[PDB]
Amino acid sequence: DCQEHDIETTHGVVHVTIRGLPKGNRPVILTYHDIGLNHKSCFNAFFNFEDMQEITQHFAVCHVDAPGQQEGAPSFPTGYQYPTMDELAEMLPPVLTHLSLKSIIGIGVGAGAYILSRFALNHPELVEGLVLINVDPCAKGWIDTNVVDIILAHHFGQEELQANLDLIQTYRMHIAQDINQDNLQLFLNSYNGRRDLEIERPILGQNDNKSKTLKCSTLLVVGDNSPAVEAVVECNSRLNPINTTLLKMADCGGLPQVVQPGKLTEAFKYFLQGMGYIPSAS
Amino acid sequence: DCQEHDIETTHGVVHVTIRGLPKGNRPVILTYHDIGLNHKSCFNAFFNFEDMQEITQHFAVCHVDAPGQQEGAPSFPTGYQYPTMDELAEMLPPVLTHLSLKSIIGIGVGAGAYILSRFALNHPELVEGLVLINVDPCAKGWIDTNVVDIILAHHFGQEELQANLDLIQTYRMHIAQDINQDNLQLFLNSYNGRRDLEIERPILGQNDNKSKTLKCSTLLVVGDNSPAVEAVVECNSRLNPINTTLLKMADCGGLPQVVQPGKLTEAFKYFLQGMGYIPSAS
Numbered sequence: 001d002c003q004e005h006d007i008e009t010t011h012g013v014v015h016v017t018i019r020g021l022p023k024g025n026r027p028v029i030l031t032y033h034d035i036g037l038n039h040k041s042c043f044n045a046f047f048n049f050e051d052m053q054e055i056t057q058h059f060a061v062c063h064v065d066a067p068g069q070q071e072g073a074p075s076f077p078t079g080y081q082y083p084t085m086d087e088l089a090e091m092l093p094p095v096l097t098h099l100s101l102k103s104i105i106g107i108g109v110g111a112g113a114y115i116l117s118r119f120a121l122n123h124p125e126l127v128e129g130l131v132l133i134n135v136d137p138c139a140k141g142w143i144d145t146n147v148v149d150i151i152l153a154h155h156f157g158q159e160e161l162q163a164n165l166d167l168i169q170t171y172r173m174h175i176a177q178d179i180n181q182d183n184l185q186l187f188l189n190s191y192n193g194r195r196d197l198e199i200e201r202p203i204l205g206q207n208d209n210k211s212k213t214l215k216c217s218t219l220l221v222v223g224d225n226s227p228a229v230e231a232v233v234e235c236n237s238r239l240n241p242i243n244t245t246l247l248k249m250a251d252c253g254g255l256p257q258v259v260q261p262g263k264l265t266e267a268f269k270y271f272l273q274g275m276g277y278i279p280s281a282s
Numbered sequence: 283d284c285q286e287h288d289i290e291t292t293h294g295v296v297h298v299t300i301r302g303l304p305k306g307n308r309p310v311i312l313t314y315h316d317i318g319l320n321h322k323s324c325f326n327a328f329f330n331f332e333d334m335q336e337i338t339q340h341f342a343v344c345h346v347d348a349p350g351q352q353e354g355a356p357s358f359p360t361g362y363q364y365p366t367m368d369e370l371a372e373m374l375p376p377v378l379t380h381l382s383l384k385s386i387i388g389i390g391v392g393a394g395a396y397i398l399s400r401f402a403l404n405h406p407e408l409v410e411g412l413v414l415i416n417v418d419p420c421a422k423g424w425i426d427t428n429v430v431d432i433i434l435a436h437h438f439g440q441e442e443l444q445a446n447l448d449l450i451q452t453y454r455m456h457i458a459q460d461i462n463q464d465n466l467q468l469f470l471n472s473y474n475g476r477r478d479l480e481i482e483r484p485i486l487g488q489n490d491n492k493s494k495t496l497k498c499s500t501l502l503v504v505g506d507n508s509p510a511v512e513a514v515v516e517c518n519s520r521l522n523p524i525n526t527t528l529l530k531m532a533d534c535g536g537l538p539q540v541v542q543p544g545k546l547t548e549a550f551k552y553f554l555q556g557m558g559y560i561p562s563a564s
Contacts, residue, residue, distance in 0.1 A: 128558055202552075204531075204545035217556040219524065242501060242527050242549055243556040249486075263486045270484075270524040274499040276410055276557060 007098045009091040011083040015070035016095060019047075022060030026277075027128050029056065030092070030104035031063040032112030034134070035188050036151035036175035038070060039063035042109055046257035051265040058278055062104070064095065066111070068183030075182040082186035085111070085194040089118035096126055105272070109133040109257065110154065110228070111191040118197070120214050129217040129275055131268060133256060136231040137197035137238060147185055148175050155254035157225040167259065199238045218244040219271045221264065225253030245271075289380045291373040293365040297352035298377055301329075304342030308559070309410050312344045312374070312386035314394030316416065317473050318433030318457040318466060320352055321345035324391050328539035333547040336564035337554065344386070346377065348393070350465030357464040364468035367393070367476040371400035378408055387554070389413045391539070392436070392510070393473040400479065402496055411499040411557055413550060415539060418513035419479035419520060429467055430458045437536040439507045449540065481520045500526045501553045503546065505534030527553075 003018045017039055022028050033042035043063060047056060067083055068076050076082065083091065092115070096104065105128050106116035113135035120127035152161055152175065156168055175184070200211030218239055222232035229248075236246045247267050249256050257264050272278050287298045299321060304310045315324035328334060329343060349365060350358050358364065365373065374397075378386065385408050390398035395417035402409040416437075434443065434454060443450055457466075482493035500521060504514035511530070518528040529549055535541045554560045 125561060204542075204548045215555050215561070240552055242529065242552040245524050245527075247524070266484075266486050267524055270522055273497050274411075274525045274556075279407060279497075 005098065007095050009094045011087045011091050012067055014067060014091045014095060015065040015073070016099070017063040017065070018099065019061040019063070020056065020059065022101070024102060026059065027103040027105050028060040028062045028099075028101050030101075030106050030116070031061065032106070032108040032116050033064075033066065033069070034110035034112055035154060035191050036148070036171075036179065036184060037109070038065050038178060040071065041171070041174040041178050042112075042255075043107070043257065046261045046264065049261040049265060051262060052268075054281070055265070055269060055272065055278060059105075062095070062099065062101065064092070066187050067091075068180055069187055071178060073180045073183060075180055076186060080186065082190050085114055085190055086118055088115045088190065089122055092116075092119045093123060093126065103128050105129045105275075107131040107133075108135070109255070110136070111187070114191070114194055114197070117199075117214065120216055121197070121199070121212055124215040127216045129219075129271070130214065131219045131221060131271065132232075132235070133221045134226060134228040134232065134254070135220065135235050136194075136228060137199055137235045138231065139194060139196050140192050143192070147181070147188060148172065151175050151184075151188065153227070157227050157253040160225055160253040167255075171255070197235075197238075199235075201238055202240055213238075213240045214243065216243065217271070217275055219247060219267065220244065221247045221249065221256055221267065223249050223252035223254065223256050223259070225251070226256075227254075287380065289377050291376045293369045293373050294349055296349060296373050296377060297347040297355070298381070299345035299347070300381060301338065301343040301345070302341070304383060307384070308341065309385045309387050310342040310344045310381075310383050311338065311389060312346060312377075312398075313389045314346050314391070314397050315348065315351070316392035316394055317436060317470050318430075318461065319391070320347050320461060322353065323453070323456040323460055324394070325389070325539065328543050328546070331543040331547060333544060333564075334550075337547070337551060337560060340560060341387070344377070344381065344383070346374070348469055350462055351469055353460065355462045355465055357462055358468060362468065364472050367396060367472055368400055370397045370472070371404060374401045375405060375408065385410050387411050387413075387557075389415070390417065391415045392418070393469070393476075396473075396476055396479065399481075399496065402498055403479075403481070403494055406497045409498050411501075411553070412496065413501045413503060413553065414514075414517070415503045416508060416510040416514065416536070417502065417517050418510060419481055419517045420513065421476055421478050422474045425474065429463070429470065430454060433457050433470070435509070439509045439536060442507050442535040446535070449535070449537075453537075483520055484522050495520075495522050496525060498525065499553070499557055501549065502526065502528045503531065503538055503549070504529075505531045505536060505538050505541070507534065508536050510536070
C-alpha cells in the first residue's frame with residue numbers, strides 16, 4: 001500500500017512517501033512542504049482529513065521531503081553544498097522516473113510552492129496542475145536571531161504570532177524538534193536566496209517579450225491574515241487568468257490546509273473536477 | 283472529412299455538420315450559434331481562421347444548427363410547436379448518441395451559450411467544458427417591430443452599431459437573407475421565453491440550499507463594448523470561481539469570434555491547455 005524511498009538524484013538524496021497505488025494513465029498527487037516543516041507536519045492532518053480520504057483513495061499520493069528535512073535525518077556537515085531552490089526543483093524529474101510516474105498534480109506550501117512552480121516551468125509536460133499555498137514568486141531582497149522565530153514569522157501573521165495560541169506553540173514545537181536544526185538553517189538559507197520566478201501575465205494582443213507563464217491549471221490559496229497575501233496577490237497578477245484561480249480563505253492566517261481543511265478539500269475537489277478527474281463526487 | 287446529418291429527436295429534426303473524425307477518447311468541439319445566425323454566420327469565420335485550424339486538426343468539430351435555422355430550411359407551418367430553450371438542450375444527447383460521441387467541449391453564442399449551459403447542468407457527464415460567448419442566464423423578464431433591427435441591437439452595442447458599418451451591414455444581410463424569416467421569429471420567441479438558468483455560486487462552507495452550478499471548466503467571453511457585458515458578469519457572479527474564468531476582451535464589439543479571432547483563439551488554446559489537452563504550442 002505505502003512505501004518510503006531514498007531516491008538518488010544528481011543533487012544528492014531526496015526522501016519520499018508513496019501512499020496508495022497509481023495506474024499508468026492517472027497522475028499522482030505529488031506533495032512538497034514549507035520551511036520548518038516536513039510532509040507530516042505540513043500535510044498529514046490535511047490529507048488524512050475525512051473529506052480528503054474520499055478524493056485521495058482514487059489517486060496515488062507522493063509526499064516529497066526536502067533534503068535533510070525528513071524525520072530522523074542525520075546532520076549535513078558544516079560546509080555542505082545545500083541544493084539551491086532551482087536545484088531542489090531539478091531533483092523532482094528523477095523522482096518521477098524512479099517511481100515510473102508519468103505526470104503529477106502538484107500541491108506546495110511556501111518554499112514547496114516555489115519549487116513546484118520552477119518544476120512546472122522547467123517541465124510543463126510533467127505537471128498537469130498546481131495548488132500553490134502561500135507562494136512568493138519574488139526574491140526576498142532582505143539579508144541580515146533565532147531560526148525558529150524567523151520561520152514562525154514566515155508562516156503566521158503578526159496579530160496571530162503575537163497572540164501565541166495553541167496553533168502557534170504547537171508548530172513552534174514542530175519546527176524546534178521534528179526537523180534536524182542544522183539542516184533547517186541550510187533549507188531556509190536556500191529559500192531566502194531564491195531568484196525571481198520570471199513569470200509575467202500574457203497579453204492576447206501579441207507575444208509579451210517571450211515572458212514565461214505556468215501552462216498548467218493553477219489554484220492559488222492564501223489566508224486573509226497570512227503575511228504572504230501581497231506576495232500571492234502579486235503572483236496572481238503575473239499568471240494566466242484563464243488557467244489560474246485565486247482562493248482568499250476567511251478568518252485564516254498561516255497553514256490554511258491544517259486550520260481550514262474542510263474548506264480547502266472542497267476547493268481541491270472543484271479544482272480536480274475542472275481538470276476532468278473524479279466526476280462522481282456526491 | 284465532411285458529413286451533414288439531419289438527426290431525428292423527440293422535439294423534431296436538428297441539422298448538424300461534422301468536420302474531421304473523433305477518435306482515441308478525445309471530446310468533439312460541439313458548437314451552438316445565437317439568435318438571427320446559423321453555424322456558418324456564427325463560427326465559420328472563427329474556425330477557418332489560421333490560428334484555429336491548428337487546434338481543430340487534433341479535435342473533431344460538430345456544428346449544430348438550431349431547428350429551422352439551418353441553410354435552405356423550409357418554413358415551419360403556422361402554429362408549429364417550436365421547441366423551448368430547455369427542449370433545444372434535450373436534443374443534444376440524441377446528437378452525441380447518434381454520432382457515437384462520449385462528451386463535448388461546448389462553444390455557445392448567446393442563446394447557444396444558454397442551451398449548452400442547460401445541457402451541461404442536465405448532463406455534466408457529457409460536458410468536459412464550456413466557452414460561453416455573450417451568455418445570459420437570467421430570463422428577459424417581460425414580453426414585446428422589424429425582427430432584423432431587434433437582433434442587430436441584441437448582438438451589437440450603441441457606438442459599435444454606427445461606427446463600423448462593414449460588419450453591421452454584412453450581418454444585417456446574414457440575419458435578413460441567409461435564414462428562414464418564419465422560423466427565425468419562432469427561435470427568437472423561444473429564446474425570450476427562456477427561464478432563469480437557476481445556477482448559484484457555491485459557498486465553501488455553506489451548501490447553497492442545494493442550488494446547482496456548472497461542474498465543468500467554463501470560459502466566459504464578452505467584449506468591453508458588447509451590450510451583454512452585465513449579463514455575462516452576472517453569470518460569472520453565479521458560477522463557481524474555481525471552475526470559471528471571465529474574459530472581458532478590451533476594444534471588442536458584440537462578436538469576439540468574428541471581430542477578434544486572433545485573441546479569442548489564443549484564449550481558447552490556453553483554455554484547452556488547462557484541461558490537459560494540446561500541451562505543446564501550435
